Symmetry: C3
Subunit: 245 residues, 3 copies
């Protein structure tokens, strides 16, 4: 079938994630469809995009079961981010609920964010033994400030909507309709001005290749027994006993 | 005549923009006079500068009509910024009212900012089809946070004095007299300490040459029909109809 | 004797500065002992460190009298920072009171900060004619925002606990016990995830070699008569009369 919905009102294209049965957690199909929707957003008269989730969550992470193309997922995910980064259109994220893990990455790749009052943002990587790419860390630091980024990454701290507004992670607190109204205003602005500013802003240095030591630690985390222990402990409904290996 | 006023009380030199008939919008003469005032600020016993505007605005942008040396304006403007950056003296901006476009650039080149309660900051570039230099974008991101910088640049969002205080764009809310009092305290501090910190702070990376793609998009914006359309639409008192070309 | 105390409750190691007779101001001995404590923190079962000061101050700066190894102090201080940066353990600073000069540097080298309501942070370098290393300036800018960093460095502005919470310099307002409770939660998280994120965060660019002009100005400040004048004026209980030389 299809895992997203696409609609257009005048010059604003709204893309809605439609996998609420997994709180919009990503898989290969959802990512592929999103990539195509972004790439084709300029086929009509659209001048702005609103990206949002169906139901209570914006995107709760990733869920690859039972994804017949799960091995392709990580690469397709990178392709989606490249498509958003390269789009001449501004993407307004209507963050309607929790944005967690891959969902937080996706929210951060939007150009602007309108956040529902009860939404929150989180990287629970420290609870699962995983490591992030450098852009995720740099862009987060730019949006919440270095100090809060340390807490989010080292302790799995949740960022509330209210604090997101304080830091600028949220540009506004509001609803999907609020996001669509703002997008309508943006769609009336000069496209080449928007395109230039978006490119320069995205080229602030957040797009960064992992240093050699970063890659070493990244691979050590991903190949560790602790990653397995976090998964087993969850299935057995008990606290994980991590060993640092 | 002259488009600025210069006065000194003890060790504080106050420079006032005096083109209130255009809300202190810059031209070649005003820029040249400001550059000279900054360069000569150390001829006396001055240890701090206060920069401010006459009337309701700090600086509402640029107005080159009918400037006999308008072709020279962009280069002279860069020279002014170089002079402020190179000055061993700390410049306290008493931002007495709106700082818009070139006025926001000028405010950001000050070392510290004391902002009047009703002042605001804005880059309305997206309403006019124009593109900014990279420093304007980087220094703005550092002062308001990356998230708010995206909104200011992509949607022409105004930054209020209250929010400026929250982000650190405003170091204090207050008046010209308040700025002059603080400058007096600063003038009693150790000059070589101030000089070192100013140089290192300004060398945070904001002074950045445009990347090749940035230059391409910058020139595309400036040479576009949309830039003309914004001007014509204003003269005809109607909404612009931008085409992205 | 010893100038620090070291205790462990389960998986949290608490290191306490114990020179309250100088408000925990550093010297060669205190720095050496701290370095050893950090290096050996992983000899037991510890997974997190809490760093704190005895009495009313976290660390009020440096006091090298009468330190028989004072000439070694600057190098040993750098060694301490290297040890904290290299530690696989997250260091939670329980900033129990003022963190000034070397004390602010030490607080900033912690991975997370829990700050007492009456604590404050300050670099009074401008009152003493001194210059800082580039990391101190970059890490401060990342924690309080560029705008407040300008005020702290150019005017010796104090950062209150409340404003520290706003900017993310403080992750939480609270007590030593509060810090120890949070550290206990962190000690249950996956160590390799924490290690990766800490390394990437610390490699944001704050660790920066002084540019040639920065070194020139740094040496000019440190060798100036104004540095001597600040010290003499203090001893004579009068305002300093700085000359910029
Ligand atoms: C060029 C625009 C851009 C920006 C950020 C990224 C991030 C996305 C992020 C995500 F998980 F979301 F896929 N990611 N994951 C791994 C990588 C990588 O580059 O190795 C990587 N790169 C990819 C592309
Ligand atoms: C070295 C200190 C410094 C810092 C920033 C700038 C900015 C100013 C800014 C302004 F419009 F204000 F003139 N500007 N405009 C164009 C450029 C440029 O460098 O191409 C440019 N460079 C110029 C000089
Ligand atoms: C590699 C981790 C790291 C990070 C910052 C520093 C700072 C500490 C700081 C302090 F005063 F605290 F010792 N400092 N002082 C001088 C220097 C230097 O590098 O020249 C310098 N370097 C040293 C080491």
């Amino acid at each position: 079938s299809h895992m997203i919905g696409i609609t257009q009102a005048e010059a604003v294209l709204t893309i809605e994630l439609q996998r609420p049965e997994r709180r919009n957690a990503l898989n290969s199909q959802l990512v592929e469809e999103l990539t195509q929707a972004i790439r084709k957003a300029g086929d009509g008269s659209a001048r702005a995009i609103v990206l949002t989730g169906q139901g209570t969550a914006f995107c709760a992470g990733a869920d690859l079961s039972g994804d017949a193309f799960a091995a392709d997922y990580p690469d397709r995910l990178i392709e989606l981010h490249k498509a958003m980064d390269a789009s001449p259109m501004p993407v307004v994220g209507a963050i309607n609920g929790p944005a967690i893990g891959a969902g937080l990455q996706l929210a951060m790749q939007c150009d602007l964010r309108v956040v529902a009052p009860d939404a929150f943002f989180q990287f629970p990587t420290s609870k699962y033994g995983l490591a992030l790419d450098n852009w995720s860390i740099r862009r987060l630091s730019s949006l919440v400030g270095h100090g809060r980024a340390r807490a989010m990454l080292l302790s799995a701290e949740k960022l509330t909507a209210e604090i997101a507004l304080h830091t600028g992670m949220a540009n506004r607190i509001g609803t999907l309709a609020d996001a669509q109204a703002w997008a309508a205003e943006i769609a009336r602005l000069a496209p080449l001005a928007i395109q230039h500013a978006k490119r320069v802003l995205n080229d602030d240095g957040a797009i960064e290749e992992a240093w050699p030591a970063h890659k070493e630690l990244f691979d050590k985390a991903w190949g560790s027994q602790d990653v397995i222990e976090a998964q087993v402990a969850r299935m057995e409904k008990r606290p994980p006993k991590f060993q640092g290996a």
